[PDB]
């Protein structure tokens, strides 16, 4: 439900940060690489969050931008990676580096990580390297921003990636509103 | 627990909208047709919400008015429809149209939707067409507002629809307070 | 976690009330008898809440005072009564009346309620009539306020009611702070 | 998710305290020893919280400082102790005393507590006495603050305590930022 927090840094205890928001102190778990970018206690901070429901707990994982959160979200969707390990992966390396490692396929580096499997490492690379394709953004892009947006949305709707791809690509060009595109796409399909 | 949000639109990423409320950024999932009616980022918005608890997540589905939320709630109560599909149904068509399709019984249209079943489509129509009856409102009405209110309440209480119907219809007429009606109805039954 | 709400009544739809608290609109389910006492929409209201976690939902049940909430809490602890029925019981009758019915043991009245069992009604009376004993308050009292408080606390701690009873009654008298009593009681027992 | 609350004490009903935060009244369960230190109703209070998710409830346990919370957290991680008993242990004795009892290994005292097991008491002592070692703080310390911090973090990451211990101890000395230490440690290990 919670995607972002805006408040004052009350305490820092890596990798935990306590952010006061209107009297409510929220504990946020952040990968060290994000952690380094946090402002000083007493100052205002903005963090992108990912909520994790768990058996005996409700947790928030935070990032400095939406790109890093996406990467995190992506990592955890795999069978072998959970939030805790995802946090460790992004504490040893930055989103950027991680992305490079995968592209350059360097398991070596990945293994140097606790709980990090080899067959796991290998599988990871393979898997992630694949997921980045359908991923657009500075991070995941070493075409059209709105089209790519309209697509994601259409895919969020239930349309098979390729279907969607086709559905917007048929009608299109700029000075459209992904919103407009999405809109159009739908009419022309139902 | 959360039925409405009032705050500033921070970002739009259809079908997701991020609404800032006193420093807390809430992610809201909205059907495209509602989405189109949202104000611009930076401005204040009011959205009616439906909370969905899930295995690994807590989600909020939002609408522009209570009527659309009801329709959504209604759709999801069926065996074949879940929140994600309900969101897709209301992204392809507006509450109004949807309501028409059902009344005019046009499966054709419904099928043109991913995950949307035929036997499902058929069953849907049949089912919804039935549920709208007991549903009062501009949407679900192509009698007395308070009586109909007193009834719903009495039905919320545990009374069988027909019982309730009868219970208020026996004593009644205007310049009553559904609250008054409900009140009266009860005394006269216990 | 949430025991009280202070905010503006945005809408009333018995038995549901929507209360705006700093931009967050909370849905509260209230027994009709409490409902009648609510102020007008647009005005400030204070409601005592009971949180109910459920399979696919998180709900808040509200009351006008702590006594009515207690009674509700009490009712639901029984095997045969759940929140929905407890809300119906307190919609047909007021906490006061309910309390009388039980004391005067009048099943007749109770049965006049949907889902309300006879063996259930009977069992209820019996059960509640018993629970009120250990219950102190205007409602549940057709001795010492602090002692009774110190006891409850000591009982919250794990002490068997009678033990606790004894533990404070040995040392005591006024111008004590239940807090003081509790304190004392403990030292003298460990 | 909630680690701290800052608001006005609305009511005290040991061991429960109701804290108003921006219109939201939060119920907090506090060990009596913490309870005694609370300010008067009407005044502002700051409490450190521990969230407990439960079958039919969501609860918050509060403390006056982070040390007492840690101790609580520690206690509950054991097989034999749950939140309710942990609250009773800290209501009979203060964090300090408790810590002493364990160090001085005095079961006698512990047993004087409801639900408190003997084999349990014994096991406890043994267990806690062990956990305090890896615990640094005034409470749990009848070396370097940042190093010890860097370690905890590295351990939060997945590193075996000893590994971490070694990893920071190799490179180190002051006027470092646990953050710096952590940082360094990582590079030199991957």
Swiss-Prot record, chains A, B, C, D:
One GO term under biological process is:
recombinational repair
Name the positions where DNA binds. Answer: 78-85, 114-117, 119-120, 123
Per UniProt, what does mutating residue 120 to N do?
A: Suppresses the RuvB 'P220S' mutation, restores wild-type phenotype
Q: Looking at the UniProt record for this protein, which Gene Ontology cellular component terms does it annotate, in alphabetical order?
A: cytoplasm; Holliday junction helicase complex; Holliday junction resolvase complex
Where on this chain is Acidic pin (motif)?
Answer: 55-56
Effect of changing residue 110 to A: reported as: Does not complement deletion, tetramerizes, binds RuvB, does not bind DNA, no migration by RuvA-RuvB
Name its co-factor(s): Mg(2+)
Q: Which CDD domains match?
A: UBA_RuvA_C
The listed locations are: Cytoplasm
- Major place of localization? cytoplasm
In terms of InterPro entries, this protein maps to: DNA_helicase_Holl-junc_RuvA_I, Hlx-hairpin-Hlx_DNA-bd_motif, NA-bd_OB-fold, RuvA, RuvA_2-like, RuvA_C, RuvA_C_sf
- Enumerate the GO terms in the molecular function aspect: ATP binding; four-way junction DNA binding; four-way junction helicase activity; identical protein binding
Which key words are in the record? Cytoplasm, DNA damage, DNA recombination, DNA repair, DNA-binding, SOS response
Q: Does the keyword Ion transport apply?
A: no
Q: Which Pfam families match?
A: HHH_5 (PF14520), RuvA_C (PF07499), RuvA_N (PF01330)
Q: How is the cofactor bound?
A: Branch migration by the RuvA-RuvB complex requires Mg(2+).
What the protein does comes down to:
The RuvA-RuvB-RuvC complex processes Holliday junction (HJ) DNA during genetic recombination and DNA repair. The RuvA-RuvB complex plays an important role in the rescue of blocked DNA replication forks via replication fork reversal (RFR); RFR and homologous recombination required for UV light survival can be separated. The RuvA-RuvB complex promotes Holliday junction (HJ) branch migration. RuvA binds to HJ cruciform DNA, conferring on it an open structure. In the presence of RuvB, ATP and Mg(2+) the junction is dissociated; hydrolyzable (d)NTPs can replace ATP but other analogs cannot. An in vitro resolvase system that forms and processes HJ has been reconstituted with DNA substrates, RuvA, RuvB and RuvC. RuvA-RuvB increases the rate of strand exchange (branch migration), dissociates the RecA filament and allows RuvC to cleave in both orientations at the cruciform junction. HJ-RuvA-RuvB-RuvC complexes resolve Holliday junctions and also undergo branch migration, providing evidence for a coupled branch migration/HJ resolution reaction.
Domain notes from UniProt: Has three domains with a flexible linker between the domains II and III, and assumes an 'L' shape. Domain III has weak interactions with the adjacent subunit. In complex with Holliday junction (HJ) DNA, an approximately square planar DNA molecule is bound to the tetramer's concave face, with the DNA accessible to solution on one side. Domain III moves 4-5 Angstroms toward the protein-DNA interface upon DNA binding. The isolated N-terminus (domains I and II) forms tetramers and binds HJ DNA but does not bind RuvB.
Q: HAMAP family this protein is in? A: DNA_HJ_migration_RuvA
- Family to which the UniProt record says this protein belongs: Belongs to the RuvA family.
The identity of this protein, by name, is Holliday junction branch migration complex subunit RuvA
